Amino acid sequence: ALLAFPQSQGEMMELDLVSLVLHIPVISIVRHEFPRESQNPLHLQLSLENSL
């Protein structure tokens, strides 16, 4: 499993690409839920602060 704390869209895209290429589970925790239309199930985004 991969743990990350991305802060920008580019970091999230790089993490998703790395997870897809390496075929491994990757989870990144962000302060806010960044919208993403990617259908890749190997990349997970964790919203530390959920919607009010």
Partner: protein, 50 residues
């Protein structure tokens, strides 16, 4: 040319479709977003169903 707007300038940018989904996102982000363009047209792929 047919519009009477003076403060609005029309610029045309052409971006070919990369034949790979892995590199499609990078090409789209490097060119389309970097140009600060308004709206993006989606075109059908050459394949009948993709």
């Amino acid at each position: 040319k047919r519009h009477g707007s003076w403060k609005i300038q029309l610029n045309a940018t052409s971006v070919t479709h990369k034949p790979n989904a892995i590199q499609m996102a990078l090409s789209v982000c490097e060119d389309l977003i970097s140009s600060q363009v308004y709206a993006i047209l989606v075109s059908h792929p050459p394949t009948p169903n993709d």
